[PDB]
């Protein structure tokens, strides 16, 4: 879908989950 | 250990 | 999942539970990739050494779940299978090479706050993200330790490991269709998939477009969360040509 991978309760509302920042910080 | 699911899905 | 934590509600809306009809039992994890297609590990469906060979009528998929055992009325959707497709070169005899399978649902599932598909990687996203040290996320309702079961969906973030380290950790022959992830003994933190997590997704959030991509499928491991061992994952992008072929032909 064109909408794949965007979570209704997170990305779609611009809310971050409790640990996604750990992933981002690893992408150096 | 699992809660029984509605019988509709087992048909 | 060993040494993980409870998922947040709607944190992994592509998570699928493969469920045995009789007896009623969790079989495996899986993932939702469109309204009618679910991705899992081949060994969840076919593994002759253990007399495992499930047919479509043996199974259900349960989508939108959080609780492992509860029937989540008004939240989860339970779907029947139209057809199973296992990779034609899946190597169950030796090392689980090409451990991948697709399941087509009888009817499309409706998306909701709790039910939503994950993206599959293009070549560029795979090249950018599948690097040693980069972390992905694994989710499942499998065992909490090697030797019990969680009340709700578990999550753990794990770093991808360099290929030479993966190979040196095991006597099993590793192929280009696999990658491994997990912390090294000296890294302090830990975590791993375990029995019951098979077939679930290893996902990464692209920093380029802020979308979640499924880079791996939980495939195999020797024990769970042992020092000096790593979890092995099917390399989804390496097998994307087969995936697209199946969906194009039978979609
Ligand atoms: C203990 N354990 C740890 C991690 C995982 Cl993902 C799993 C789930 N996979 C499995 O149980 C798979 C299925 C077949 C044998 N599996 C294993 O993980 C075997 N323990 C190792 C093995 C790999 C390849 C070929 C033969 C044997 C289990
Ligand atoms: C598994 O089950 C199918 C259906 O009965 C059968 O045709 C097949 O030979 C079995 N073994 C496989 C696919 O390795
Ligand atoms: Na080795
Ligand atoms: Na380990």
Short mmCIF file of C-alpha atoms and ligand atoms in Angstrom, two decimals:
data_model
loop_
_atom_site.label_atom_id
_atom_site.label_comp_id
_atom_site.label_asym_id
_atom_site.label_seq_id
_atom_site.Cartn_x
_atom_site.Cartn_y
_atom_site.Cartn_z
CA UNK A 1 0.00 0.00 0.00
CA UNK A 2 1.00 3.65 -0.48
CA UNK A 3 0.39 3.99 3.24
CA UNK A 4 2.61 1.08 4.31
CA UNK A 5 4.80 1.38 7.39
CA UNK A 6 3.11 4.45 8.88
CA UNK A 7 1.41 3.46 12.13
CA UNK A 8 -2.01 4.95 12.88
CA UNK A 9 -1.21 5.51 16.55
CA UNK A 10 2.32 6.81 15.98
CA UNK A 11 3.57 8.21 12.66
CA UNK A 12 0.10 9.27 11.54
CA UNK A 13 -0.34 11.32 14.74
CA UNK A 14 3.34 12.37 14.93
CA UNK A 15 3.76 10.48 18.23
CA UNK A 16 6.93 8.51 18.90
CA UNK A 17 7.06 5.13 20.62
CA UNK A 18 9.22 4.65 23.72
CA UNK A 19 12.24 3.11 22.00
CA UNK A 20 12.30 4.08 18.32
CA UNK A 21 14.92 6.72 19.09
CA UNK A 22 17.35 3.90 19.97
CA UNK A 23 17.06 2.72 16.36
CA UNK A 24 17.56 6.18 14.89
CA UNK A 25 20.61 6.75 17.07
CA UNK A 26 22.19 3.55 15.68
CA UNK A 27 21.90 4.74 12.06
CA UNK A 28 25.19 6.63 12.09
CA UNK B 1 -4.31 -21.69 27.80
CA UNK B 2 -5.94 -19.66 25.03
CA UNK B 3 -9.40 -18.15 25.27
CA UNK B 4 -11.80 -19.96 22.92
CA UNK B 5 -12.32 -18.06 19.68
CA UNK B 6 -15.79 -17.61 18.11
CA UNK B 7 -16.92 -20.84 16.43
CA UNK B 8 -17.53 -18.91 13.20
CA UNK B 9 -13.79 -18.90 12.51
CA UNK B 10 -13.45 -22.63 12.97
CA UNK B 11 -16.01 -23.37 10.24
CA UNK C 1 11.30 -12.80 23.02
CA UNK C 2 14.00 -12.92 25.68
CA UNK C 3 14.92 -9.76 27.64
CA UNK C 4 12.44 -7.62 25.73
CA UNK C 5 9.59 -5.47 27.01
CA UNK C 6 5.82 -5.22 26.60
CA UNK C 7 4.79 -3.62 23.33
CA UNK C 8 2.83 -0.37 23.35
CA UNK C 9 -0.68 -0.54 21.90
CA UNK C 10 -0.53 -0.25 18.10
CA UNK C 11 3.27 -0.31 18.17
CA UNK C 12 3.46 -3.19 15.68
CA UNK C 13 0.19 -3.15 13.72
CA UNK C 14 1.61 -5.46 11.07
CA UNK C 15 2.19 -8.23 13.64
CA UNK C 16 0.32 -11.42 12.83
CA UNK C 17 -0.22 -14.54 14.94
CA UNK C 18 -0.35 -17.89 13.13
CA UNK C 19 -2.86 -19.93 15.07
CA UNK C 20 -3.54 -23.67 14.99
CA UNK C 21 -7.23 -24.58 14.84
CA UNK C 22 -6.92 -27.90 16.66
CA UNK C 23 -5.77 -27.85 19.26
CA UNK C 24 -6.00 -24.05 19.60
CA UNK C 25 -2.36 -22.99 19.90
CA UNK C 26 0.06 -20.30 18.85
CA UNK C 27 2.18 -21.64 15.99
CA UNK C 28 4.35 -18.75 14.87
CA UNK C 29 4.55 -15.03 14.21
CA UNK C 30 4.09 -13.45 10.78
CA UNK C 31 3.51 -10.02 9.25
CA UNK C 32 0.89 -8.17 7.27
CA UNK C 33 2.21 -6.76 4.00
CA UNK C 34 -1.09 -5.85 2.30
CA UNK C 35 -4.79 -6.35 2.93
CA UNK C 36 -4.64 -9.91 1.61
CA UNK C 37 -1.03 -11.11 2.05
CA UNK C 38 0.88 -12.28 5.12
CA UNK C 39 4.61 -13.06 5.23
CA UNK C 40 6.15 -15.72 7.49
CA UNK C 41 8.98 -18.28 7.78
CA UNK C 42 8.71 -21.45 5.70
CA UNK C 43 9.67 -23.58 8.69
CA UNK C 44 6.49 -22.43 10.42
CA UNK C 45 4.57 -24.37 7.80
CA UNK C 46 6.95 -27.04 6.57
CA UNK C 47 9.61 -28.87 8.55
CA UNK C 48 9.79 -32.64 7.85
CA UNK C 49 12.36 -33.40 10.58
CA UNK C 50 9.58 -32.59 13.10
CA UNK C 51 6.74 -34.06 11.03
CA UNK C 52 5.48 -30.53 10.39
CA UNK C 53 3.50 -29.93 7.22
CA UNK C 54 0.51 -27.68 7.66
CA UNK C 55 -2.22 -27.22 5.07
CA UNK C 56 -4.37 -24.09 4.59
CA UNK C 57 -7.29 -25.60 6.51
CA UNK C 58 -5.12 -26.31 9.55
CA UNK C 59 -4.51 -22.65 10.32
CA UNK C 60 -5.84 -19.17 11.02
CA UNK C 61 -4.10 -15.82 11.14
CA UNK C 62 -4.98 -13.41 13.91
CA UNK C 63 -4.32 -9.77 13.18
CA UNK C 64 -4.31 -6.67 15.40
CA UNK C 65 -3.54 -8.55 18.61
CA UNK C 66 -1.78 -7.51 21.79
CA UNK C 67 -2.71 -10.11 24.39
CA UNK C 68 -1.18 -13.55 23.67
CA UNK C 69 -4.11 -15.66 24.89
CA UNK C 70 -7.21 -13.46 25.07
CA UNK C 71 -9.74 -13.21 22.28
CA UNK C 72 -9.55 -9.47 21.67
CA UNK C 73 -13.15 -8.70 20.80
CA UNK C 74 -13.73 -5.66 18.57
CA UNK C 75 -9.96 -5.31 18.04
CA UNK C 76 -8.40 -8.40 16.48
CA UNK C 77 -9.45 -9.89 13.13
CA UNK C 78 -9.26 -13.62 12.47
CA UNK C 79 -8.67 -14.61 8.84
CA UNK C 80 -8.77 -17.92 6.96
CA UNK C 81 -6.14 -18.92 4.43
CA UNK C 82 -6.83 -19.23 0.72
CA UNK C 83 -3.38 -20.53 -0.18
CA UNK C 84 0.15 -21.08 1.14
CA UNK C 85 3.25 -20.45 -0.99
CA UNK C 86 6.61 -21.73 0.22
CA UNK C 87 9.88 -20.73 -1.49
CA UNK C 88 10.71 -23.48 -4.02
CA UNK C 89 14.34 -23.57 -2.88
CA UNK C 90 13.69 -23.44 0.88
CA UNK C 91 16.40 -25.65 2.38
CA UNK C 92 14.84 -27.48 5.32
CA UNK C 93 17.30 -30.35 4.95
CA UNK C 94 20.35 -28.34 5.94
CA UNK C 95 20.36 -24.74 7.14
CA UNK C 96 16.93 -23.16 6.52
CA UNK C 97 18.29 -21.25 3.53
CA UNK C 98 15.47 -19.18 1.94
CA UNK C 99 13.21 -19.59 4.97
CA UNK C 100 10.24 -17.67 3.60
CA UNK C 101 6.55 -18.26 2.83
CA UNK C 102 3.53 -16.21 1.80
CA UNK C 103 -0.06 -16.77 2.82
CA UNK C 104 -3.00 -15.35 0.87
CA UNK C 105 -6.11 -14.58 2.94
CA UNK C 106 -9.59 -15.65 1.83
CA UNK C 107 -10.92 -12.10 2.29
CA UNK C 108 -9.11 -8.76 2.59
CA UNK C 109 -8.71 -7.56 6.19
CA UNK C 110 -9.90 -4.08 7.15
CA UNK C 111 -7.18 -1.73 8.39
CA UNK C 112 -7.64 0.03 11.75
CA UNK C 113 -5.63 1.70 14.50
CA UNK C 114 -4.36 -1.79 15.33
CA UNK C 115 -4.06 -3.35 11.88
CA UNK C 116 -1.77 -1.88 9.24
CA UNK C 117 0.80 -3.26 6.77
CA UNK C 118 4.56 -2.88 6.98
CA UNK C 119 6.66 -1.88 3.97
CA UNK C 120 8.94 -4.22 2.05
CA UNK C 121 12.40 -2.79 1.28
CA UNK C 122 13.61 -1.59 -2.13
CA UNK C 123 17.27 -2.11 -3.08
CA UNK C 124 18.24 1.36 -1.89
CA UNK C 125 16.62 1.12 1.56
CA UNK C 126 18.20 -2.32 2.04
CA UNK C 127 21.63 -1.04 1.04
CA UNK C 128 21.32 1.93 3.40
CA UNK C 129 19.98 0.19 6.49
CA UNK C 130 21.38 -3.36 6.50
CA UNK C 131 24.72 -2.43 8.06
CA UNK C 132 26.54 -3.85 11.09
CA UNK C 133 25.68 -1.87 14.20
CA UNK C 134 22.36 -0.57 12.86
CA UNK C 135 19.47 -1.75 15.02
CA UNK C 136 16.17 -3.30 14.02
CA UNK C 137 13.21 -4.39 16.12
CA UNK C 138 11.87 -7.89 16.67
CA UNK C 139 8.42 -8.66 18.08
CA UNK C 140 6.56 -11.78 19.10
CA UNK C 141 4.61 -13.87 21.63
CA UNK C 142 7.29 -16.56 21.90
CA UNK C 143 9.08 -17.87 24.97
CA UNK C 144 10.57 -15.42 27.48
CA UNK C 145 13.57 -17.69 28.12
CA UNK C 146 15.30 -20.76 26.70
CA UNK C 147 14.05 -22.91 29.60
CA UNK C 148 7.64 -18.88 30.59
CA UNK C 149 5.22 -17.24 28.16
CA UNK C 150 4.32 -13.54 27.94
CA UNK C 151 0.92 -12.02 28.68
CA UNK C 152 1.20 -9.59 25.77
CA UNK C 153 3.27 -8.93 22.64
CA UNK C 154 7.00 -8.48 23.39
CA UNK C 155 9.48 -6.19 21.65
CA UNK C 156 13.27 -5.95 21.58
CA UNK C 157 15.73 -3.82 19.57
CA UNK C 158 18.86 -5.61 18.35
CA UNK C 159 21.89 -4.56 16.31
CA UNK C 160 22.83 -6.22 13.02
CA UNK C 161 26.08 -8.16 13.35
CA UNK C 162 29.05 -8.24 10.93
CA UNK C 163 28.99 -11.32 8.68
CA UNK C 164 32.33 -12.77 9.86
CA UNK C 165 31.10 -12.71 13.46
CA UNK C 166 27.81 -14.38 12.49
CA UNK C 167 29.72 -17.14 10.71
CA UNK C 168 32.27 -17.63 13.52
CA UNK C 169 29.46 -18.08 16.08
CA UNK C 170 28.11 -21.31 14.59
CA UNK C 171 28.91 -24.57 12.81
CA UNK C 172 25.91 -24.07 10.53
CA UNK C 173 26.58 -22.93 6.96
CA UNK C 174 25.41 -19.29 6.64
CA UNK C 175 24.21 -17.99 3.25
CA UNK C 176 23.71 -14.60 1.61
CA UNK C 177 19.98 -15.07 2.24
CA UNK C 178 20.48 -14.71 5.99
CA UNK C 179 21.72 -12.08 8.36
CA UNK C 180 22.26 -12.20 12.11
CA UNK C 181 21.53 -9.76 14.90
CA UNK C 182 22.13 -9.46 18.63
CA UNK C 183 24.51 -8.02 21.17
CA UNK C 184 28.03 -9.37 21.68
CA UNK C 185 28.98 -10.72 25.14
CA UNK C 186 31.06 -7.64 25.98
CA UNK C 187 28.31 -5.23 24.89
CA UNK C 188 26.44 -5.71 28.16
CA UNK C 189 22.82 -5.52 26.99
CA UNK C 190 21.12 -8.62 25.57
CA UNK C 191 17.97 -9.98 23.94
CA UNK C 192 16.93 -12.47 21.30
CA UNK C 193 14.00 -14.13 19.60
CA UNK C 194 13.04 -17.57 20.87
CA UNK C 195 10.69 -20.51 20.16
CA UNK C 196 7.29 -19.12 19.18
CA UNK C 197 8.79 -15.96 17.64
CA UNK C 198 9.59 -17.78 14.36
CA UNK C 199 8.16 -16.11 11.29
CA UNK C 200 7.78 -12.70 12.94
CA UNK C 201 9.27 -9.51 11.50
CA UNK C 202 12.64 -7.78 12.01
CA UNK C 203 11.80 -4.15 11.17
CA UNK C 204 13.74 -0.91 10.84
CA UNK C 205 12.45 2.65 10.65
CA UNK C 206 13.88 4.46 7.65
CA UNK C 207 15.36 7.84 8.68
CA UNK C 208 14.82 8.98 5.06
CA UNK C 209 11.05 8.69 4.89
CA UNK C 210 10.08 7.75 8.47
CA UNK C 211 8.43 4.49 7.35
CA UNK C 212 8.88 1.05 8.85
CA UNK C 213 10.40 -1.64 6.63
CA UNK C 214 10.57 -5.36 7.24
CA UNK C 215 14.18 -6.33 6.60
CA UNK C 216 14.12 -9.79 8.15
CA UNK C 217 12.02 -12.76 9.22
CA UNK C 218 12.82 -14.56 12.48
CA UNK C 219 14.35 -17.81 11.26
CA UNK C 220 16.65 -19.71 13.61
CA UNK C 221 18.94 -19.65 16.60
CA UNK C 222 20.91 -22.08 18.71
CA UNK C 223 19.34 -21.66 22.13
CA UNK C 224 17.91 -18.24 23.04
CA UNK C 225 19.96 -15.23 24.20
CA UNK C 226 23.12 -17.24 24.77
CA UNK C 227 26.40 -15.34 25.03
CA UNK C 228 28.37 -15.55 21.81
CA UNK C 229 25.36 -16.73 19.81
CA UNK C 230 23.15 -14.64 17.52
CA UNK C 231 19.68 -14.85 16.04
CA UNK C 232 19.44 -15.50 12.33
CA UNK C 233 16.93 -13.80 10.07
CA UNK C 234 15.77 -14.42 6.51
CA UNK C 235 17.03 -11.57 4.27
CA UNK C 236 13.75 -10.24 2.91
CA UNK C 237 15.21 -8.04 0.19
CA UNK C 238 17.33 -10.87 -1.23
CA UNK C 239 14.10 -12.80 -1.75
CA UNK C 240 11.93 -9.91 -2.94
CA UNK C 241 11.99 -11.16 -6.53
CA UNK C 242 10.18 -14.34 -5.46
CA UNK C 243 7.78 -12.34 -3.29
CA UNK C 244 6.82 -10.03 -6.15
CA UNK C 245 6.50 -12.97 -8.54
CA UNK C 246 4.05 -14.75 -6.23
CA UNK C 247 1.93 -11.68 -5.61
CA UNK C 248 1.98 -10.70 -9.30
CA UNK C 249 0.93 -14.20 -10.40
CA UNK C 250 -1.65 -15.05 -7.72
CA UNK C 251 -2.70 -11.67 -6.30
C1 LIG D 1 15.74 -22.15 20.00
N1 LIG D 1 15.38 -21.13 19.01
C2 LIG D 1 16.03 -19.95 19.03
C3 LIG D 1 15.72 -18.96 18.11
C4 LIG D 1 14.72 -19.22 17.19
CL1 LIG D 1 14.28 -18.00 15.97
C5 LIG D 1 14.07 -20.43 17.17
C6 LIG D 1 12.98 -20.71 16.15
N2 LIG D 1 13.58 -21.44 15.04
C7 LIG D 1 13.80 -22.75 15.05
O1 LIG D 1 13.51 -23.47 16.00
C8 LIG D 1 14.44 -23.35 13.83
C9 LIG D 1 13.45 -24.23 13.09
C10 LIG D 1 14.19 -25.51 12.75
C11 LIG D 1 15.32 -25.63 13.77
N3 LIG D 1 15.51 -24.26 14.25
C12 LIG D 1 16.51 -23.79 15.00
O2 LIG D 1 16.58 -22.61 15.36
C13 LIG D 1 17.58 -24.77 15.42
N4 LIG D 1 17.77 -24.66 16.86
C14 LIG D 1 18.91 -24.50 14.71
C15 LIG D 1 18.83 -24.96 13.27
C16 LIG D 1 19.00 -24.04 12.24
C17 LIG D 1 18.92 -24.46 10.92
C18 LIG D 1 18.70 -25.80 10.62
C19 LIG D 1 18.54 -26.72 11.65
C20 LIG D 1 18.61 -26.30 12.98
C21 LIG D 1 14.42 -21.38 18.12
C1 LIG D 2 3.56 -31.64 2.42
O1 LIG D 2 2.16 -31.70 2.22
C2 LIG D 2 1.76 -31.72 0.78
C3 LIG D 2 0.30 -31.91 0.68
O2 LIG D 2 -0.20 -33.18 1.09
C4 LIG D 2 2.48 -32.77 0.01
O3 LIG D 2 2.08 -32.71 -1.39
C5 LIG D 2 3.91 -32.61 0.15
O4 LIG D 2 4.59 -33.65 -0.59
C6 LIG D 2 4.31 -32.66 1.56
N1 LIG D 2 5.78 -32.53 1.70
C7 LIG D 2 6.56 -31.38 1.21
C8 LIG D 2 5.92 -30.19 0.51
O5 LIG D 2 7.77 -31.39 1.36
NA1 LIG D 3 31.42 -21.10 11.67
NA1 LIG D 4 23.59 -14.01 22.15
#
